[PDB]
Each structure stands twice: as structure tokens, then as C-alpha cells.
Amino acid sequence: DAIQQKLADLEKRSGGRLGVALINTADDSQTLYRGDERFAMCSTGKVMAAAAVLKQSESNPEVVNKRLEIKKSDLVVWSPITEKHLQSGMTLAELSAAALQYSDNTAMNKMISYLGGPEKVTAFAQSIGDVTFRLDRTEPALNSAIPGDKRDTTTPLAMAESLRKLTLGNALGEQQRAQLVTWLKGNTTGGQSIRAGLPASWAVGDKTGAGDYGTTNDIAVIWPENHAPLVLVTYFTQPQQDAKSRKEVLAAAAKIVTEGL
Numbered sequence: 001d002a003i004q005q006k007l008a009d010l011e012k013r014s015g016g017r018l019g020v021a022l023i024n025t026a027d028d029s030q031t032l033y034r035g036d037e038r039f040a041m042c043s044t045g046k047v048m049a050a051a052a053v054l055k056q057s058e059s060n061p062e063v064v065n066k067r068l069e070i071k072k073s074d075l076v077v078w079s080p081i082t083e084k085h086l087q088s089g090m091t092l093a094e095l096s097a098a099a100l101q102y103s104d105n106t107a108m109n110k111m112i113s114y115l116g117g118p119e120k121v122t123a124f125a126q127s128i129g130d131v132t133f134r135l136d137r138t139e140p141a142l143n144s145a146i147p148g149d150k151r152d153t154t155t156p157l158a159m160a161e162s163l164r165k166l167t168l169g170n171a172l173g174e175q176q177r178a179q180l181v182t183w184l185k186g187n188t189t190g191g192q193s194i195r196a197g198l199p200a201s202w203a204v205g206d207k208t209g210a211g212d213y214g215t216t217n218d219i220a221v222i223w224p225e226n227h228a229p230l231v232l233v234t235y236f237t238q239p240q241q242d243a244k245s246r247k248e249v250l251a252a253a254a255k256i257v258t259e260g261l
Contacts, residue, residue, distance in 0.1 A: 006256045007033040014249045016214065019235035021160035022257045025168065026228040031257045035157035038132075039235040040145035042209030043103045044159065044217045045121070045135055045152060049111045050096040050183065051166045052124035054176040056115070057092075064093040068110055077140055079106035093179075100183045100207060105139035112138055125162065128171040132158035143211035145237055159219055160233045167205070167221045168229060181205055184221060192247040193218035194232055197254030201225040214243025218250050222258075230258065 011018040011033075020033040057063035067089045070082050081098035082090065083106070090098070095111055098104035112118055118135040125133035133154045136142070142152040165171040167181050184205025193216075195204045202224045209217035215237040222230040234250040 003031060003256060003260075004033065007253065010249065010252055010256065014236070014238075014246060016236055016238040016243075016246070016249075018249065018253060019156040019233070020253055020257055021156035021231075021233045023160050023164055023231040024228070025164070025230065030157070030160075032157055033253075036155050038150055038153040038155055039217070039237055040143070040149070040151075040153050040211055040213075040215050041133075041135075041159070042143050042145065042152075042211035042215055042217055043105075043108075044207050044209035044219050044233075044235075045142065046099045046103065046108050046209075047163065047166070047180075047184070047207045047219065048125055048133060048135070049108060049115070049121050050100055051172060051176075051180055052115055052121055053092055053096055053111055054172055054180060055124060055127075058173050058176060065091050067091050068095065068114065070106065070110070074106055074109065076105045076109065079104050082106035082110070097183055097186075101186050101188050103189050103208065108139050128162060128165050130154075130158055130162045130165075133162065143215070145211035145213040145215040147213060147237070147239065156233045156235050159235075160231050163219055163221060163233065164231045168231070181221065190218060190220075193250045194220040194222075194234055194254045195251075196247070197251035198222065198258060199224075210245050211237075213241055214238035214245060216245045216247055216250060218247075218254075220254075227261070232257070 022031040081104045095107040099107040121135040136151040190206040206220035
């Protein structure tokens with residue numbers, strides 16, 4: 001296709017490795033590029049953690065409003081929300097919101113710890129039929145994004161299929177599904193990534209991720225005004241450890257794959 005060639009050309013120009021999975025829920029068609037190759041998820045992994053917490057909340061009434069203490073020693077880099085709540089503490093819902101909307105790293109760690117560790121997030125992914133996702137480490141260690149390292153990786157297609165199940169399908173109960181969508185729609189960090197490549201009439205809920213090796217990621221659910229939803233994952237990584245983020249690559253990739261409507 002011209003789409004396959006244009007993505008290959010975007011990839012070559014950018015000096016990295018690009019991974020794309022678009023799922024069109026109108027007809028279930030997929031548009032894939034390196035769709036079955038592993039990429040470091042970085043903070044896009046926060047979506048799976050939040051969904052695991054939401055799932056536990058379906059049967060356990062001491063989850064979403066359970067208050068957790070935030071110790072000064074808990075704080076890691078990129079924690080703009082949790083760093084302001086040392087005295088107040090935060091609920092698991094508030095931590096989930098902070099992780100998703102502000103990419104708060106300490107919030108993610110608290111969620112991982114509450115669930116029982118990184119393996120428990122993998123276990124949640126397994127429970128929804130995602131046999132690819134793996135979470136191995138905590139924040140910020142999981143952002144190393146070393147080429148060839150399988151730690152804290154998934155494939156663009158696996159992540160798209162899972163994001164679909166979680167936001168549009170049957171992985172969560174209606175109340176929880178709706179909550180996750182609301183959180184994603186309120187993301188504060190996604191303006192220059194997938195959303196930048198899409199029409200203004202398409203509503204977006206997304207989660208970005210950034211890591212070492214110039215790793216620049218975004219996953220989105222997309223709601224057109226007059227068409228059925230789309231699910232889009234754009235992953236990008238580079239050969240040099242110190243490479244700068246390239247959000248414009250994700251916007252350009254989103255544009256290529258959605259251009260035909």
C-alpha cells in the first residue's frame with residue numbers, strides 16, 4: 001500500500017524504529033506497521049496499571065477511595081501531583097488519575113505496590129487475553145528502553161487490542177470502563193503527539209510515554225463526531241541512548257494511517 005510505503009519512509013527519515021497499530025471499530029480492519037515487534041512502553045504502561053486497579057474495585061469496595069500515605073522517600077522523578085500530597089495522602093482513584101493525566105511516576109509506583117508488584121500488572125493483562133504485555137520494573141527504571149531488551153515491552157498490535165478491550169470492550173464493567181475513558185480524555189500531556197495528527201472533530205483520550213533512546217510513545221482511543229471509534233498506538237524509538245523525543249513523528253504517523261478517514 002501507499003500507507004505501508006509512507007510509514008516506511010517516515011521511519012527511514014526519522015532515523016529510528018516506528019511501530020503502529022490502528023484498529024477501526026467500524027469494520028474491525030487493522031493498519032499495522034511492525035505491529036508484532038516489541039517496543040518499550042514507558043508511561044503508556046500506566047494505562048494497564050490503572051485498569052488493573054479499576055478491575056479489583058469491581059468486587060472489592062475498599063479500592064477506589066482507599067487512602068494511601070505518600071512518604072517523602074516514596075517520591076521519584078516526574079511526580080508533579082504526588083509531591084504535593086505528602087500531608088493529605090491520596091486515594092487509589094486520585095493516584096490512578098495522576099498517573100494517567102500527569103504521568104505521575106510516584107503515583108504509578110503506589111499503584112504497582114498496592115496491586116502486589118510489576119508481575120501483578122502482567123497478570124491483569126494476561127487475564128484480559130493480552131499474552132504480550134510485560135511489566136518488569138518500577139518507575140523510573142522501566143524507561144531504560146534499551147534496544148533488544150524485552151523488559152517492560154509490548155507490541156503495537158497487542159497494546160491496541162488491549163486498549164480496545166479496556167475502553168470499548170468487555171474487560172471492565174461499564175462503570176469502570178467509563179471511568180478509564182474519562183481519565184484518558186482528561187490527559188494533560190498529549191497535545192503534541194497523536195492528537196496533533198488528527199482532525200479537530202475527533203475527540204481523543206490518550207496516554208503518552210517517553211523514555212531513554214529517544215523513546216516517544218502514544219496510545220489513543222479516538223471518537224469521531226460522525227463515525228465509529230478508532231484505537232491507535234504509535235511507538236517510536238531510536239538507536240542513540242541520549243536521543244531527543246520526537247513527538248512530531250507520532251503525529252505524522254497518526255496522520256498517515258487516518259488520512260483516508
